[PDB]
């Protein structure tokens, strides 16, 4: 019943009837800035209920890249569409030019007083594995973490000068805590069966044996993920590429098992 603009970056736009389970509209913006060259990319569609207003800015050599997504639920609300002074200073880098990995970190000032310093780790087994800069993201005030058989996610978000500075986090520099949780991914009969679920050694602040059930992929394909998580993960959730996310957490080795 909701209707959204649906625009490809090429500027071909049309109205889109949202499917069931998509009851927000989104506008997504990418600015690619380099010396005296700007490229602006804009994309629009119907999107899932869980989306929020968010931004991320990071410098990567002589390049600056800025992402923003704005979402609303009223009806062709995305059909329309600041930038003055400098507020919180943050460390910035990014894995697309090896800048993070190589320690070539730079400083960036945020543009709204709402933005914070971000550090995000996305280890998958086309997103950058490491991003540092300015913005606001779901799970922000603070930090959150998850790891399992093929994944390490970490997000740190803070409001003091250059608080995202330091060496980049990698899973291997976090100690095994002694907690063990089951790991799996897929669905209850394919991927997450007692036959396919196994015990992994939890690391650093991740000591919750976690289970998220929801949907993934084009349609509402059902999906499920088990592993080791921070307390903070057990309270949105874009970190597992899922939608109607349902999280249980327990804090005993093995408790995570398909019961």
């Amino acid at each position: 019943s909701l209707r959204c603009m649906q625009c490809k970056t090429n500027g071909d736009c049309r109205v889109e009837e949202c499917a069931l389970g998509q009851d927000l509209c989104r506008t997504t913006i990418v600015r690619l800035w380099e010396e005296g060259e700007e490229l602006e990319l804009v994309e629009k569609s119907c999107t899932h209920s869980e989306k929020t207003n968010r931004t991320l800015s990071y410098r990567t050599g002589l390049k600056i890249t800025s992402l923003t997504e704005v979402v609303c639920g009223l009806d062709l609300c995305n059909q329309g569409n600041y930038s003055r002074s400098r507020y919180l200073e943050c460390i910035s880098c990014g894995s697309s030019d090896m800048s993070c990995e190589r320690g070539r970190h730079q400083s960036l000032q945020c543009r709204s007083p709402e933005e914070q310093c971000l550090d995000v780790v996305t280890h998958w087994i086309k997103d950058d594995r490491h991003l540092r800069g300015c913005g606001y993201l779901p799970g922000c005030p603070g930090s959150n973490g998850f790891h399992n058989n093929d994944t390490f996610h970490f997000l740190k978000c803070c409001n003091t000068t250059k608080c995202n500075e330091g060496p980049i986090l990698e899973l291997e520099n976090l100690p095994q805590n002694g907690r063990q949780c089951y790991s799996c991914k897929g669905n209850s009969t394919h991927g997450c069966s007692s036959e396919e679920t196994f015990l992994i050694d939890c690391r650093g602040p991740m000591n919750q044996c976690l289970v998220a059930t929801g949907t993934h992929e084009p349609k509402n394909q059902s999906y499920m993920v088990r592993g080791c998580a921070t307390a903070s993960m057990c309270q949105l959730g874009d970190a597992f590429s899922m939608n109607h996310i349902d999280v249980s957490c327990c804090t005993k080795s093995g408790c995570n098992h398909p019961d």
Partner: antibody
Amino acid sequence: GVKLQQSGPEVVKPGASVKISCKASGYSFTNFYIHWVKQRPGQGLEWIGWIFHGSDNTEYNEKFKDKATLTADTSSSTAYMQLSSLTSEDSAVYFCARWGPHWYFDVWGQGTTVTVSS
Amino acid sequence: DIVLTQSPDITAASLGQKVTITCSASSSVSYMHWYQQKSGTSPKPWIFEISKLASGVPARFSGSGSGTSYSLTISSMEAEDAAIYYCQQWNYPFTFGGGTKLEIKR
């Protein structure tokens, strides 16, 4: 500011139980692992276990699973360790220690002496 | 389950002598830390993450190693360095080596 205050020396009978305390100040208690460590007289250091956030989130040394129980009281930022069914082999100094930001035992309490005797 | 052997158990060192404590791990541990203890008082963090000095640790102290072998060096032995030193794996079993008692030779 940042410290771990342990409860006083204990004299207890064999077969009895003892519970000892570790009051944390000057930082956010529930964001950090508290570990417990045993040292018998003239001997080394044994890891007993940890607690994170509260009583439902613990890990033990297999050697102490039937001996130690770790609890926490968030309202007062205090960790506890109960030792049950005492013998003379449990006569030791017991330390609590924070697991710090760069993952070593960074702050220690002073120790509590447990003498088991009649 | 990772055994840590500390060698030697006891050494007496002259003032000015280079001292080396080694810690041996039956299997590979990414980070090893070192604690100093006097008079069965609280162990003091001394060297963390292999080679980093704790606040107030003097520059004559260093640490190094990897995998199954780590060392603590004191490049020139002083009287206040007499103590028991314990290595510890950074991770889960948090096992401590059995300790090296460092004394003054005379």
